[model samples]
Target: SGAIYVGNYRVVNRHLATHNDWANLVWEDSSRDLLVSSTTAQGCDTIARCDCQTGVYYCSSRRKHYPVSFSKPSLIFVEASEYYPARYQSHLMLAVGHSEPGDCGGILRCQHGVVGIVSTGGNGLVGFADVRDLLWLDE
Candidate 1:
């Protein structure tokens, strides 16, 4: 018979890409945090937090900084440099702006608060998954 059992689930250092969406969840044991990104195909380093309301998310890999905003519920906007392509589930919350390809898995902050995770982008617009969506799964 099939039964439910309580067990500890240890998260490993791996990439968790969603089949139905164009996003990635990277688990880093040293940091003990899940880094959100676009896809496993892309590489990312770590998550960052904004220091002030006007502060930006520094992309160390590119040596650039981008601004973020949350204009609506479940929506985030980023001011990036170039445009990249991304695919995601239709039902998931989205963020969009002008961001580069490797910008995924990065953090989006607004007023010193984390708003979303870089997910997808295209046509001069970059997309992200709202932080609320990710936290929902953790709970």
Candidate 2:
């Protein structure tokens, strides 16, 4: 993991994009405090597990779990970025740094988000993938 540069904008050190939708997003909606997002692109299959009484369950794509009260009551967003500046490696993670309790042995945050490494996928070395209308806010 080298130092993240912010000269080319491509080498985003700080949040490439603030106010959510940082790197790449699948789906997000925190209108009513249901902060949930899904980046179903392998290595990043995300889903907000909600309980009938406990409410929304926040968990990292890394399979790490968090309490239902980890984030605020509403207004959530998804973000992404490269943890390390590399040719094919990209660091993708969930915001709201909160680690699970006990046995977690990690920070109280999902700080270590997901990773979205580039690939070919048989498409002549597809370095990256793009999508239309990155963020979707359900008001």
Candidate 3:
């Protein structure tokens, strides 16, 4: 007789990104909360998915965060730095730490007001990943 083997079908990590037109989205979560934001008051407001990837039920491109808000969020694979706020949030406030246009940087923060830092560029992103963990990717 031969030995039998089994494998895990579940994915522990995933990533989403938008290239040109929100093409790299990874859809980290199945969310129900809706968001609407606008850089310019005269422009349209975009609904952002807190998750990493987009769902089939997402709204229009112009009304989404991929093209309108954060461009395209990247899925990290590994990290060698500390964790902090501003990495996951990926906002101007958080990006201020290390996320520059010419450099790789990130910050993270959870709903509980905790902060995580992501730098050196090694973090990873998972599908429907936990917001609390996303906030602790790098520093």
* Candidates' C-alpha lDDT: 0.37, 0.23, 0.22
Compute the lDDT for candidate 2: 0.23
Q: What is the descending TM-score order?
A: 1, 2, 3
The TM-score, computed over Cα atoms with residue i paired to residue i, of candidate 1 is 0.40
TM-score of 3: 0.16
- Compose the digit string of candidate 1's lDDT tens values, residues 4-122: 01111121112333442223323321121123323324222222233232324544346666764433332233334333123222212333345565666565555534544555556
TM-score, each model? 0.40, 0.17, 0.16
Clash totals for all candidate models: 8, 13, 34
Residue-level lDDT tens digits of model 2 in 20-68: 4344433322221111222333222221222111222223334554433
lDDT (Cα, 0-100) at 49 in candidate 3: 23
lDDT of 3 by residue, 1-139 (tens): 0000112111111121213212322223312011111111132212222433222211121232111112133342332223332333322111211122112212232333212122222122211222223321211
Candidate ranking (lDDT, best to worst) = 1, 2, 3
Error of 2 at 20 (Å): 14
